[PDB]
């Protein structure tokens, strides 16, 4: 170390107070005041505005979020879509509950959970397949050939539903990328494209309704950031 003999300036190591993220390092004097001898009212007196629980930013990501709520009739046959495709996590984190929370974070590394409900009165038949093609923006050459046909989707990571047996279905998609995380400020490198095909058509006129939920588990949030890019 270059040695330094200082006697005219105090190594003012106090007047240095980090508050969560921001570090103030001050000269002259730091002052602080208010009403003295602070107490708090017991929890019976207030707390009619809160639940007996705390919510971090990791939940709010573990909450299921409705993506789709629609139907599909008997006119769609095998190997055709019954639901719109979902980009993971672009078509999930774009809902306001998640987007308002992920803001201020650099990136996200977590496994995503796509759950789908199915409505059936016991007179309806059919089967339906829910698969996920990994990294669709990195191998666009192969996307539509692995998702235009059942038996090329089901050898991928998939989840089936017998319409007259399963009323709920949930596929767990772990995070997978050439990278460590999912860039949030640029939304670069989605790690799967959920597609929904028809394994077998409906046998009656009555369509089937479905709800698509999506949440995350195993959540590792990145570094805090402003998150704004030029345009």
């Amino acid at each position: 170390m270059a040695e330094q003999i200082n006697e005219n300036y105090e190594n003012k190591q106090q007047l240095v107070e980090q508050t969560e993220i921001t570090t103030f390092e001050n000269d002259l004097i730091v002052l602080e005041d208010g009403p003295q001898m602070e107490e708090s009212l017991p929890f019976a007196f207030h707390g009619q505005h809160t639940d007996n629980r705390q919510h971090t930013v990791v939940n709010f990501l573990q909450r299921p979020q409705v993506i789709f709520d629609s139907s599909w009739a008997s006119d769609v046959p095998r190997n055709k879509q019954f639901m719109d495709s979902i980009m993971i996590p672009d078509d999930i984190i774009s809902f306001p509950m998640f987007a308002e929370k992920l803001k201020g974070f650099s990136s996200l590394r977590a496994t995503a959970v796509i759950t789908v409900q199915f409505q059936t009165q016991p007179f309806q038949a059919g089967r339906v397949m829910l698969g996920s093609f990994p990294l669709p923006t990195l191998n666009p050459t192969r996307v539509k050939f692995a998702t235009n046909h059942v038996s090329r989707l089901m050898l991928l990571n998939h989840v089936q539903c017998d319409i007259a047996k399963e009323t709920e279905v949930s596929l767990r998609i772990p995070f997978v990328s050439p990278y460590n995380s999912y860039d949030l400020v640029s939304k670069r490198f989605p790690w799967a494209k959920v597609v929904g095909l028809v394994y077998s058509p409906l046998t009656t006129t009555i369509p089937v309704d479905f709800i698509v939920y999506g949440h995350f588990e195993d959540v590792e949030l990145g570094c805090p950031t402003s998150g704004m890019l030029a345009q």
Partner: protein, 280 residues
């Protein structure tokens, strides 16, 4: 803290300790070079072992010898200014040029340091039909005599046979009076700090083209950091201005490497090496 009245990051302090992180926490990530690269880089002493091509001897005749100084190979070659004249419109265009030369991995490291110590490795590539290649070192100066011998009887000899080993690899030791020697040009003449050595590469039968690739011997070591050398942009190799008789590349270079394409740049008219006094 991060700020104050004393110098917060002098040189002597930067060599040993880093300032506090902006996070006021541990800022360091673990080394994973071996986990992605598959290899670890820590010291330039090892990296100089990499052999790349350095010079080429073309502009002599069908000779059976080629003598040249060894310390000149640790230097990076001289950069030259090339005058081009348009065969039609007769106005001058100006670029840069390496005259039958180029730097090595070794030369990127050696130009940061003042002195060297250790042996230099020289590997030769010749044209077809050459059967042998022989290497010998000689002192360049019989001290106190106006002339040096043309033969020697106790010098090292090393013979490689091309059609069974196509690259003639030689290792030239460190023979100098001093602990660590100097490899750049100077005007010192009283007594000398460089070990002045020649190196004679022969070919049987005699040939014209000799391609030399240089690298660091095991015992290679440089001594005193001095600083980054004068550099030229590598992208300047592909930039060119077109004139009538052909292309004028900003960084013009010869077929120094017997395995690189010959760039389609017209020959210059005059060459001038950048002197230290030319810098503005």
């Amino acid at each position: 803290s991060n700020s104050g009245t004393e110098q917060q990051n002098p040189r002597g302090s930067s060599l040993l300790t880093d300032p506090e992180s902006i996070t006021k926490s541990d800022p360091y990530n673990p080394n994973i070079s071996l986990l992605i690269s598959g290899e670890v880089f820590t010291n330039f002493r090892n990296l100089i072992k990499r052999v790349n091509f350095r010079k080429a001897t073309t502009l002599n005749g069908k000779r059976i010898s080629d003598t040249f100084d060894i310390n000149s190979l640790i230097e990076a070659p001289r950069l030259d200014i090339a005058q081009y004249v348009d065969t039609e419109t007769k106005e001058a265009k100006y670029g840069f040029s390496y005259f039958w030369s180029a730097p090595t991995t070794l030369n990127i490291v050696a130009e940061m340091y003042a002195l060297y110590r250790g042996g230099v490795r020289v590997k030769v590539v010749t044209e077809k039909g050459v059967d042998f290649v022989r290497a010998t070192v000689s002192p360049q100066q019989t001290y106190g005599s106006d002339v040096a011998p043309t033969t020697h009887i106790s010098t090292p000899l090393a013979i490689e046979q091309i059609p069974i080993k196509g690259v003639a690899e030689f290792q030239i030791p460190y023979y100098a009076p001093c602990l660590s020697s100097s490899f750049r040009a100077n005007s010192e003449t009283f007594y000398y700090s460089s070990g002045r050595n020649n190196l004679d590469i022969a070919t049987s039968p005699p040939s014209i083209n000799r391609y030399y690739a240089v690298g660091a011997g095991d015992d290679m070591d440089f001594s005193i950091f001095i600083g980054t050398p004068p550099c030229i942009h590598a992208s300047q190799t592909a930039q060119f201005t077109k004139i009538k008789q052909g292309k004028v590349y900003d960084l013009r270079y010869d077929q120094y490497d017997p395995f690189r394409e010959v760039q389609d740049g017209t020959a210059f008219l005059n060459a001038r090496s950048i002197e230290d006094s030319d810098l503005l």
